[PDB]
């Protein structure tokens with residue numbers, strides 16, 4: 128249950144219950160529910176070639192779960208991100224700049240799972256159960 | 264032990280906490296992934312018995328020691344992968360044994376230089392990947408001479424700071440050598456005066472190297488004297504990243520000759536940089552992930568033959584008038600832009616897919632200004648208003664509107680003028696066909712993909728009568744209940760016919776009589792309860808048929824024919840057709856004589 132806490136939001140993460148391959152992932156600053164430009168530090172060893180990497184996001188505002196969302200970070204050709212060239216077994220140390228614009232009037236209990244998927248082979252790379260809570 | 268993804272060929276021994284190699288494994292195998300197992304050492308003869316292996320992967324296998332003659336038995340291996348083993352040093356003849364190797368990956372193997380690297384023995388080697396290592400030098404070794412087939416070396420995420428004359432000296436000896444180099448993620452600061460004199464490279468890749476502009480700028484100046492087929496230049500959002508990026512840094516590029524320039528993600532950006540004059544005589548400009556917002560200031564003397572823009576941020580469509588542009592690609596924009604006319608007499612290939620492109624007045628000569636367009640892809644965009652029947656574009660042979668909102672297409676014969684066209688995709692365009700005359704004009708057409716659409720009264724109507732040459736027709740997912748009388752009489756050359764995922768309530772034998780040439784017929788997931796006797800009897804050339812997911816009434820004698828036909832023809836049925844109620848296979852039912 129790896130957590131920091133901003134003074135308006137407490138962020139904690141953990142592995143998914145049936146997928147627990149390793150990652151050290153971390154944000155600076157610790158995210159505010161309203162606006163945080165900064166970096167996400169990632170350390171792990173990809174179980175598969177990170178070219179064609181993408182995510183499957185299942186989010187839940189106040190325990191009301193949303194539809195699936197599919198973010199691609201690596202299209203496999205001249206990719207924005209350096210870690211897209213990474214290979215199965217090689218180490219990945221990279222802080223990515225992330226920019227959260229916010230939500231003016233944010234609410235309660237958010238909750239996000241994230242499946243990194245190697246698009247080449249559709250195999251599972253890792254899975255992260257997040258949590259974000261407001262105020263007291 | 265391992266997973267048998269493919270019986271006696273491919274295995275998946277990944278993360279099996281395997282102390283050693285396993286012995287109970289077949290010898291026939293052409294592939295095995297052994298990654299993530301604690302192998303620690305690599306034994307002499309550790310794979311000597313196995314000897315038909317093309318792909319062997321030992322990524323992250325904790326390896327510290329490659330004993331002489333370890334691979335000894337693997338004379339058909341083309342790909343060996345060693346990513347992420349702490350094999351600090353490789354003994355002379357550490358490999359010698361591998362005769363047919365084409366791809367060596369030694370990424371993150373704690374390697375210090377190429378010179379010691381015992382690979383001069385490998386004649387058939389094509390790619391060498393040694394990125395993510397401790398190399399501090401770009402010196403192309405002398406042993407390259409021996410390596411006739413090697414064309415890609417990857418020196419990424421290393422510690423190289425300088426490229427000297429002597430470093431690349433091997434290449435002045437060898438102008439009859441094809442080679443590409445990836446030098447990305449190296450903190451290069453100093454590239455030596457006249458260090459790139461008299462040398463050819465195929466592609467040079469320099470991204471996320473340079474920290475400052477005057478470092479970058481100086482470095483690009485001493486690139487002088489170079490022929491690259493393809494120059495890739497940029498940085499990554501997760502890196503050493505430039506304070507400022509001006510076109511003035513492109514200076515120096517005017518000395519280097521370039522065939523294919525390729526810019527990628529850059530933090531700071533101004534449009535003018537692609538308009539920059541040293542990029543004028545390039546034979547193929549290209550942009551990926553680029554913050555560019557407009558593109559018009561484009562001198563007509565620029566000799567570019569293909570322009571590509573991929574995942575850029577254009578705010579308004581290019582107005583372009585390059586006389587020599589033969590192939591334009593503008594795909595995956597961020598802005599949901601709208602099409603504006605162009606003038607490109609050389610243009611023969613146009614991919615504008617996957618933007619949210621709108622397009623009032625499609626389409627005719629005036630729109631582009633060419634008589635030689637052969638490939639036009641408008642897929643995955645938005646509102647495309649059909650206002651003109653392709654008059655003046657009769658050379659078109661490939662046309663794609665997948666997932667785009669075609670409008671007015673049911674009002675008139677919008678493809679009338681496309682006498683030569685061969686492939687047409689209007690699937691998921693949400694077209695509800697009102698109009699028998701929708702496909703007039705299309706006499707050469709071979710492939711018609713139109714799944715996801717719909718038909719007035721849900722009735723398949725007589726739209727195919729002037730499309731005799733159709734050999735592929737996909738009408739799946741079209742909410743069809745019925746087929747009108749005439750509708751397939753003309754389709755004598757058709758091989759594949761898809762009508763799965765519809766709501767067909769019945770068949771008429773008369774719809775298949777003249778499909779003389781039909782290899783594949785899919786009628787699966789419909790509402791068919793039964794089939795006219797003998798319906799499939801004259802489909803001479805049929806190889807596959809799908810009939811499952813339909814509530815077949817299996818009462819005898821009604822099910823007599825179909826049940827017998829399947830049992831006579833099982834090799835051809837794909838999937839398994841079942842009786843409603845019981846769920847029993849249809850091939851299995853027998854009737855009382």
Ligand SMILES: *[C@@H]1O[C@H](CO)[C@@H](O[C@@H]2O[C@H](CO)[C@@H](O)[C@H](O)[C@H]2NC(C)=O)[C@H](O)[C@H]1NC(C)=O
Nearest residue numbers: 142143144145146238239240241254255256257
């Ligand atoms: C993600 O986190 C939550 C919290 O552990 C889990 O959703 C829960 O898990 C169990 C099993 O389904 C439920 O009975 C609980 O009610 C949930 N917990 C809470 C506090 O609501 C979920 O299983 C986790 N695992 C994932 C997403 O893989």
Ligand SMILES: *[C@@H]1O[C@H](CO)[C@@H](O[C@@H]2O[C@H](CO)[C@@H](O)[C@H](O)[C@H]2NC(C)=O)[C@H](O)[C@H]1NC(C)=O
Nearest residue numbers: 714737739740759760761762763764783784785
């Ligand atoms: C007929 O059309 C159906 C649906 O349009 C095709 O089924 C698709 O098959 C692909 C690959 O075989 C799958 O990944 C998709 O899931 C299928 N789509 C659906 C909606 O199930 C089927 O392949 C076609 N038959 C052919 C071309 O012979």
Ligand SMILES: *[C@@H]1O[C@H](CO)[C@@H](O)[C@H](O)[C@H]1NC(C)=O
Nearest residue numbers: 168169170171218219220221
């Ligand atoms: C990741 O980055 C930090 C930067 O100091 C470093 O301390 C750590 O060792 C790095 N880990 C790896 C595996 O490179």
Ligand SMILES: *[C@@H]1O[C@H](CO)[C@@H](O)[C@H](O)[C@H]1NC(C)=O
Nearest residue numbers: 414415440441442443465492
């Ligand atoms: C050199 O090889 C590349 C790929 O390695 C190939 O695509 C190209 O045609 C070759 N270059 C020349 C100039 O023949």
Ligand SMILES: *[C@@H]1O[C@H](CO)[C@@H](O)[C@H](O)[C@H]1NC(C)=O
Nearest residue numbers: 703704706727728729730753
């Ligand atoms: C289909 O159009 C052709 C092309 O001119 C025409 O000759 C004919 O009238 C049409 N088909 C039939 C059966 O009349």
Ligand SMILES: *[C@H]1O[C@H](CO)[C@@H](O)[C@H](O)[C@H]1NC(C)=O
Nearest residue numbers: 474475476503504505506507
């Ligand atoms: C680039 O990187 C290093 C960071 O340690 C720094 O010394 C150097 O001054 C930086 N320059 C610029 C322009 O960012």
